[PDB]
Design an enzyme around this catalytic site. Structure first.
Site, short mmCIF file in Angstrom:
data_model
loop_
_atom_site.label_atom_id
_atom_site.label_comp_id
_atom_site.label_asym_id
_atom_site.label_seq_id
_atom_site.Cartn_x
_atom_site.Cartn_y
_atom_site.Cartn_z
N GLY A 170 0.80 -1.23 0.00
CA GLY A 170 0.00 0.00 0.00
C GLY A 170 0.82 1.27 0.00
N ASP A 202 -8.26 5.84 12.92
CA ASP A 202 -8.34 5.16 11.63
C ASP A 202 -8.87 3.74 11.77
OD1 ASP A 202 -8.20 5.05 8.81
OD2 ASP A 202 -6.08 4.49 8.85
#
Ligand SMILES: c1cc(-c2cnn3cc(-c4ccc(N5CCNCC5)cc4)cnc23)c2cccnc2c1
Ligand SMILES: [Ca+2]
Ligand SMILES: [Ca+2]
EC number: 2.7.11.30
Length: 293
Positions: free
Chosen positions: A15, A131
């Site tokens: 990512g 998050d």
């Protein structure tokens, strides 16, 4: 160093953040998150939470070590969970009442542990995650989950009344951003604002899991929240339109209301999703409700 003696065996996540590897250390599997130098502040924030605050709980990803050198390598080394993230697990697995509740209660217990301040020498500040999402939750062998990724964490201590917001330019995953983050009305100097952002995200995760629980021979396919109204990798603006302007919330299938468990989960979700952040349930209240079922 722990890093020197690790053999990296396979990449299990890639990512923008960096990569996560299954590795071996002293004959045991470990996970190694290798941070891009762009995300150095998240590495340090996790390192301080784990190595200074001593954050430890059965529903929080277990820290082993942190290592950096420099041109620059930043490693976070943790327990490895072969089932992968809740996001991965839900794509292939359907659930029954027992396994659905074990999942959501474990997430609630982890989140309550983060949120509640504990006093004493063995204690910890109150912590909000910022998050929370299904990719940041791991499924352990025992069927419970644990919460990972404390790179954006913010802390508060009653004794000093100090909000420790840190200094990270990274922002939360856009799909899971609460209305007040998307319209920029969030009260950034109030610690409780960050807890209420977690609760919003938790509600979305509850929805993701509940869909995969079988009732009366029916189950829904895995979808991420707002799958029907925003693209993959949605923008700040896409989310603002859907969540703030149109006031959309994930759809509760009518079949859920004929099962007692999904009925209870539907009620919890809705009370995580109020536009008024103050009206949202606390993590402790969610835990207590899930324990009662
Ligand atoms: C450090 C470590 C992890 C972390 C710990 N265990 N783990 C397993 C995976 C992982 C992910 C996917 C798989 N598989 C995918 C395909 N089907 C089988 C399972 C297997 C393992 C990913 N990340 C981690 C981690 C996970 C999320 C966020 N930060 C993290 C920081
Ligand atoms: Ca070193
Ligand atoms: Ca789903």
């Amino acid at each position: 160093t722990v890093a020197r003696d690790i053999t990296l065996l396979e990449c299990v996540g890639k990512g923008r953040y960096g990569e996560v590897w299954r590795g071996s250390w002293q004959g045991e599997n470990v996970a190694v998150k290798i941070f891009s130098s762009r995300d150095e502040k998240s590495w340090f924030r996790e390192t301080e939470l784990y190595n200074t605050v001593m954050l430890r709980h059965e529903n929080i990803l277990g820290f082993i070590a942190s290592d950096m050198t420099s041109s620059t390598q930043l490693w976070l080394i943790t327990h490895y969970h072969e089932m992968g993230s809740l996001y991965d697990y839900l794509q292939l697995t359907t659930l029954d009442t027992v396994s659905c509740l074990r999942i959501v209660l474990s997430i609630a217990s982890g989140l309550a542990h983060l949120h509640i301040e504990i006093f004493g020498t063995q204690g910890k500040p109150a912590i909000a995650h910022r998050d929370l999402k299904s990719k940041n939750i791991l499924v352990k062998k025992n069927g419970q989950c644990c919460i990972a990724d404390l790179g954006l964490a913010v802390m508060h201590s009653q004794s000093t009344n100090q909000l420790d917001v840190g200094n990270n330019p990274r922002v939360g995953t856009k799909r899971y951003m609460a209305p007040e983050v998307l319209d920029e009305t969030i009260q950034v100097d109030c610690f409780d604002s960050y807890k209420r952002v977690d609760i919003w995200a938790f509600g979305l995760v509850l929805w993701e899991v509940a869909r995969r629980m079988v009732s009366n021979g029916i189950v829904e396919d895995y979808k991420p929240p707002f799958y029907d109204v925003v693209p993959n990798d949605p923008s700040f603006e896409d989310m603002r339109k859907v969540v703030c302007v149109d006031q959309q919330r994930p759809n509760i299938p009518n079949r859920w209301f004929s099962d007692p468990t999904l009925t209870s989960l539907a009620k919890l979700m809705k009370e995580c999703w109020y536009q008024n952040p103050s009206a949202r349930l606390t993590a402790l209240r969610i835990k207590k409700t899930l324990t009662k079922i």
